[PDB]
Amino acid sequence: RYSASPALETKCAKARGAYLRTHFKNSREVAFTINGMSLKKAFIFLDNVKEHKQAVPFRRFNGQARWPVKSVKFFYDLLKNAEANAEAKGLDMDKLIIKHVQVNAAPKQSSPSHIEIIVAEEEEAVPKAN
Amino acid sequence: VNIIKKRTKPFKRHQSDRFKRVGESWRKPRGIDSCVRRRFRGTISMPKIGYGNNKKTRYCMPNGLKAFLVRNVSDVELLLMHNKTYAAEIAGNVSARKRVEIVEKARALGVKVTNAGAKVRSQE
Amino acid sequence: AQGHRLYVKAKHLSFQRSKHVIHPGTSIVKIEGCDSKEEAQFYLGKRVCYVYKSSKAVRGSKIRVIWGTIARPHGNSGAVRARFVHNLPAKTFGSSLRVMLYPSNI
Amino acid sequence: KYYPAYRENVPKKARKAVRPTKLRASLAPGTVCILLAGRFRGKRVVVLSQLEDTLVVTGPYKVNGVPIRRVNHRYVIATSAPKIDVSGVSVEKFTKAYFAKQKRSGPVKKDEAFFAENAPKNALPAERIADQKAVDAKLLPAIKAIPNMKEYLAASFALSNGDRPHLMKF
Amino acid sequence: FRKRTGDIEVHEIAEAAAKRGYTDLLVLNEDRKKTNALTLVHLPNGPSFYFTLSNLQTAKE
Amino acid sequence: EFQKVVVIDAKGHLLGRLASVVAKQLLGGQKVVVVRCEELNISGHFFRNKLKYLAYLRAFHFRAPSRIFQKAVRGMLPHKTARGQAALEHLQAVEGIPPPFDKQKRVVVPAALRVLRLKPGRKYCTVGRLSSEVGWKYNDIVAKLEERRKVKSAAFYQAKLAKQKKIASAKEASPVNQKLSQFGY
RNA sequence: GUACGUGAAAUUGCUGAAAGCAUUGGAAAUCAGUCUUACCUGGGUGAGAUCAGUAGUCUCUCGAGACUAUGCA
RNA sequence: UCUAGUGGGCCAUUACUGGCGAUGCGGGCCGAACGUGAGGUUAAGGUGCCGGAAUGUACGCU
RNA sequence: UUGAGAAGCUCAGACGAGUAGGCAGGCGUGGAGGUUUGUGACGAAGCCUUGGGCGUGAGCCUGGGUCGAACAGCCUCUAGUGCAGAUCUUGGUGGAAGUAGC
RNA sequence: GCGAAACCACAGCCUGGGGGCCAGG
RNA sequence: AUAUGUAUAAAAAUAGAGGUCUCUCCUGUAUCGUAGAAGAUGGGCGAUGGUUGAU
């Protein structure tokens, strides 16, 4: 099961990767950075980090900013998968917001990580008829 | 008589909070330098016989009755003459077939059941 | 001026205590205008209460009351000992209590 | 169902006989007492008679609007105001049953208890109003003749800064 | 919404509500502090349906 | 009798006695303001407190008389506890008399007054002069501001007394005051 | 869902809320259980049975249980 | 009759005597020998504030 | 007056630190015999739980969640029966640390 | 990009009196 | 640039001040406000009052 359900099924898409050969600590900081963004902005941010434009800040494992290429490569593909899952699910692509991106450790085989991403549509409030 | 309890807190073991390997069941402190065994100030209490409750209201639930664990219908019929003194309690391993039969019988007998709403639904 | 008050203002001083051991079960209350243990004999047995605010609408009100009773004088300077149905919180030291006039004998 | 089914611990014979209650000395009938608790706190009320435990007191209803009510002698301040002539009004009718509350009943059937629109109101019957008016008639001349009684009873008792009850003499 | 009181029964409320102008009676059954069922009867003798509610969420939740 | 806010004129009061009175009030939930803290008095000759302070100078070293009194109260409170820190925030010790406080009644503490506690002829020091010698440099302006406030307050008292004359004369004019004067009023 | 029965603890991530060992209580969150329907008394209407100024069957030991008829004072 | 454990030392007054040691509690050696509690009253020490309790009364020195 | 589990019930009074050491009564686990017309796919056992209860305690009972095949009380029998530590053994996992470093 | 290891009761402001106790900063 | 009436204002001295040669202090236990279905609905008499909300 996915850890969090921050939306409804008709208005969300998920993509995940298990036992990914990367580093758990670097992935956690990248995941913390892109959490809460929009799919269009996150794609721009990950490409910027790749082409030495912006650096991923380190908050818990600072020992500051850096440009982890392996971590962003995994998150770029996972978000592309989640975007594609939104196409097949008939979702709109303008309100797509990364609602819950989480990174968990994997069986030591190194420090592999499990990554899950859930992208939802921007919740809106309709005007009250009064 | 009212059901007076001298103490309501559990007698936690010393340093059961410090360590997860150390359980919270009471163990007398066998140590010879133990400050808490020495009953200093602020040290947590130790089971003494003086906390023992009144022999007249020992084993009594707050409603003045005593729990009598029951496994079938034949057990609740033993409590016919002690319904002001005892309460039936259905065991956790009794199925929902029997639980209904236990509860229905005990209702006519005027016996309180502590867990009569378990494993069942209402239809009315 | 406005009136409608039938109580004597009092302060929750502290608990009954020695130098290092405290007893929350009895509280020390200073009453307005009572400055000796002879005058404190008047207020014995009166009902003292602590009134405070809350957030839940218990029976449609934000008010909450802890009742009590004056038990005996304390010291020489008009302090009294008050027993409350629930022991007063330690955060209410110096708070304002209300010493009603009932039960009355004068 | 009559032969006992249980141990039936019969209570040992308690030796607590019921003796008449000795009230205060200052709670003589006709005195003006300040009500301390209840909805009518702070009202000044004339005492009529001394019941077994309480005082049957009432404010002249045309003065302060305090009807005929019981009050415990522990929730009244007995003042030294001059007493009101109350010997002219019968008071023997005010008994325990007179002040008792309506015994629970409300004869109902199992179709109106659901869809609960049958509850009457407990409006005070006429004879209670008539007794109150009769008492007012027998009390008003006594309070009118002596000055300041009418304004005193229509007033309310309330403390202010500088008022110390342990030293004020009521 | 009439709070259910006393010894009245669903077959008795239906008759009572039928003469009082009601046309459908819903009975929310709970036990153990959870609303698990809902029976509705079409007044006066219409078909009666028995449902078991689940995943009951309030507006706060 | 206690209320929520009191203003205390610190002139003629001893430092320790007034602080101990103030500290007990603060722990009782009473907000206390002390004004004219530079008129506080200390028992003993000037040099004695002077050598006490310079020994203290030999921790933050504060020279203002208002903060000299504040330290005195602070040592008399449980400052290490949340209760004591709450009490300390209820105390506003100021030098001179701020305009927000010169229009309000100011009480004095008889148990702390120097006249009622010091034998006549006993040498005594003033906190204001002691502070002005250890580094405080505002007593000129504080004294000058005191004269202006005292002059303005004196005019107010004269206006109040003049208005009081009319009502005082009209008191005995009405025969009711003598009709039932037997009540003692 | 083969990294597959159950799946504990140490441990890690995310979300939510709060804050920056014992005693006693406050606030917040939560929870336990809690009764009305019965007793007595009176009458009306019918019902029957252990009732019949009543007849039979079976099992035990005159009458003790179980019955099947028939009546309802 | 048997049958386990020990045959250390330290402190203080006058080798003796106690006390510590297997002993927590109030005060800071003095007081006090401990089941769980309610209430009352005290010992030692205390009552300006921290701190529960007289910024008591009276006589004096600084 | 029913209050004989005579191993029961009932009356009274005193007493309560405790190392070594002695005595007694109890709680728990694996297996054995007997027993409960015992529990169990309408859910056994286990595990989780700011749900409740009992016992001074060792501990026991229970609600809910999870689970899926066996289990328990009582009377005796028996023992490879109770852990916080032995720089204990084995396994698992941390902070050090994304540090030293390549 | 890869990536340890030893070690770890618990943790880390000073002064005085008897690294947490007492009173202060 | 954008909280139960929350009432009370002279100075300085205790071996002297204030007010008009005279008077007062010796604490505020005083002074101001204090009755109303938590403050209702009307009438008369006497002064130009008092309390206020909004400009």
From Swiss-Prot, chain A:
Record GO biological process: cytoplasmic translation
Q: Which InterPro entries match?
A: Ribosomal_uL22 (IPR001063), Ribosomal_uL22_CS (IPR018260), Ribosomal_uL22_euk/arc (IPR005721), Ribosomal_uL22_sf (IPR036394)
Task: Output the CDD domains linked to this UniProt entry.
Answer: Ribosomal_L22 (cd00336)
- Tell me the compartments it is located in: Cytoplasm
Provide the alphabetized UniProt keywords: Cytoplasm, Ribonucleoprotein, Ribosomal protein
User: One GO cellular component from the entry?
Assistant: cytosolic large ribosomal subunit
The keyword Cytoplasm is assigned to this record: yes
Q: What is its main location?
A: cytoplasm
Enumerate the GO terms in the molecular function aspect: structural constituent of ribosome
Give one Pfam hit by family name.
Answer: Ribosomal_L22
The UniProt record's further free-text remark is: There are 2 genes for uL22 in S.pombe.
NCBIfam families, per database record = uL22_arch_euk (TIGR01038)
Please describe what this protein does: Component of the ribosome, a large ribonucleoprotein complex responsible for the synthesis of proteins in the cell. The small ribosomal subunit (SSU) binds messenger RNAs (mRNAs) and translates the encoded message by selecting cognate aminoacyl-transfer RNA (tRNA) molecules. The large subunit (LSU) contains the ribosomal catalytic site termed the peptidyl transferase center (PTC), which catalyzes the formation of peptide bonds, thereby polymerizing the amino acids delivered by tRNAs into a polypeptide chain.
The entry's family comment says: Belongs to the universal ribosomal protein uL22 family.
Record's protein name: Large ribosomal subunit protein uL22A
What is the species of this protein?
Schizosaccharomyces pombe (strain 972 / ATCC 24843) (Fission yeast)
Source gene? rpl1701
Curated annotation (Swiss-Prot), chain B:
- Give the UniProt keywords, A-Z: Cytoplasm, Nucleus, Phosphoprotein, Ribonucleoprotein, Ribosomal protein
What does UniProt give as the signal peptide span?
none
- Output the Pfam families linked to this UniProt entry: Ribosomal_L32e (PF01655)
What PROSITE patterns is this protein classified in? Answer: RIBOSOMAL_L32E
GO biological process annotations for this chain's record? Answer: cytoplasmic translation
Q: Where would you find this protein in the cell?
A: Cytoplasm; Nucleus
Primary location recorded for the protein, binned into one broad class: cytoplasm
Superkingdom of source: Eukaryota
According to the UniProt entry, which residues carry Phosphoserine? Answer: S74
Purpose:
Component of the ribosome, a large ribonucleoprotein complex responsible for the synthesis of proteins in the cell. The small ribosomal subunit (SSU) binds messenger RNAs (mRNAs) and translates the encoded message by selecting cognate aminoacyl-transfer RNA (tRNA) molecules. The large subunit (LSU) contains the ribosomal catalytic site termed the peptidyl transferase center (PTC), which catalyzes the formation of peptide bonds, thereby polymerizing the amino acids delivered by tRNAs into a polypeptide chain.
Known partners and oligomeric status:
Component of the large ribosomal subunit (LSU). Mature yeast ribosomes consist of a small (40S) and a large (60S) subunit. The 40S small subunit contains 1 molecule of ribosomal RNA (18S rRNA) and at least 33 different proteins. The large 60S subunit contains 3 rRNA molecules (25S, 5.8S and 5S rRNA) and at least 46 different proteins.
UniProt miscellaneous comment: There are 2 genes for eL32 in S.pombe.
Q: What is this protein called?
A: Large ribosomal subunit protein eL32A
Give the species.
Schizosaccharomyces pombe (strain 972 / ATCC 24843)
Curated annotation (Swiss-Prot), chain D:
| One Pfam family cited in the UniProt record for this chain | Ribosomal_L6e
Q: Where in the cell is it found?
A: Cytoplasm; Nucleus; Nucleus, Nucleolus
Q: Which UniProt keywords apply?
A: Cytoplasm, Nucleus, Phosphoprotein, Ribonucleoprotein, Ribosomal protein
What terms describe the molecular function in GO for this protein?
A: RNA binding; structural constituent of ribosome
Q: Which GO terms describe its cellular component?
A: cytosol; cytosolic large ribosomal subunit; nucleolus; nucleus; preribosome
Q: Record's InterPro entries?
A: 60S_ribosomal_eL6, Rib_uL2_dom2, Ribosomal_eL6_CS, Ribosomal_eL6_KOW, Translation_prot_SH3-like_sf
Phosphoserine found at: S80, S90
What are the BP-aspect GO terms?
cytoplasmic translation; ribosome biogenesis
Do you know which CDD domains this protein is assigned to? KOW_RPL6 (cd13156)
Q: What is its main location?
A: cytoplasm
Quote the function comment for this protein.
Component of the ribosome, a large ribonucleoprotein complex responsible for the synthesis of proteins in the cell. The small ribosomal subunit (SSU) binds messenger RNAs (mRNAs) and translates the encoded message by selecting cognate aminoacyl-transfer RNA (tRNA) molecules. The large subunit (LSU) contains the ribosomal catalytic site termed the peptidyl transferase center (PTC), which catalyzes the formation of peptide bonds, thereby polymerizing the amino acids delivered by tRNAs into a polypeptide chain.
The record's similarity note reads: Belongs to the eukaryotic ribosomal protein eL6 family.
PANTHER family xref list: 60S RIBOSOMAL PROTEIN L6, LARGE RIBOSOMAL SUBUNIT PROTEIN EL6
Q: What is this protein called?
A: Large ribosomal subunit protein eL6
What is the native source organism of this protein?
Schizosaccharomyces pombe (strain 972 / ATCC 24843)
From Swiss-Prot, chain F:
| Pfam families xrefs | Ribosomal_L13
Show the GO cellular component annotation of the record: cytosol; cytosolic large ribosomal subunit; preribosome; ribosome
Q: Which keywords describe this protein according to UniProt?
A: Cytoplasm, Phosphoprotein, Ribonucleoprotein, Ribosomal protein
Note the Gene3D superfamilies from the entry. 6.10.250.3250, Ribosomal protein L13
> What is the annotated localization of this protein?
Cytoplasm
- Output the superkingdom of the source species: Eukaryota
Q: Which CDD domains would you find in this protein's record?
A: Ribosomal_L13
Q: Which residues carry this modification: Phosphoserine?
A: S181
Offer an example of a GO molecular function term for this protein.
structural constituent of ribosome
Entry's Gene Ontology BP terms: cytoplasmic translation; negative regulation of translation
User: What functional role does this protein have?
Assistant: Component of the ribosome, a large ribonucleoprotein complex responsible for the synthesis of proteins in the cell. The small ribosomal subunit (SSU) binds messenger RNAs (mRNAs) and translates the encoded message by selecting cognate aminoacyl-transfer RNA (tRNA) molecules. The large subunit (LSU) contains the ribosomal catalytic site termed the peptidyl transferase center (PTC), which catalyzes the formation of peptide bonds, thereby polymerizing the amino acids delivered by tRNAs into a polypeptide chain.
List the NCBIfam families.
Answer: L13_A_E
So what family is this one in?
Belongs to the universal ribosomal protein uL13 family.
Provide the assembly information: Component of the large ribosomal subunit (LSU). Mature yeast ribosomes consist of a small (40S) and a large (60S) subunit. The 40S small subunit contains 1 molecule of ribosomal RNA (18S rRNA) and at least 33 different proteins. The large 60S subunit contains 3 rRNA molecules (25S, 5.8S and 5S rRNA) and at least 46 different proteins.
What gene does the UniProt entry assign to this protein? rpl1601
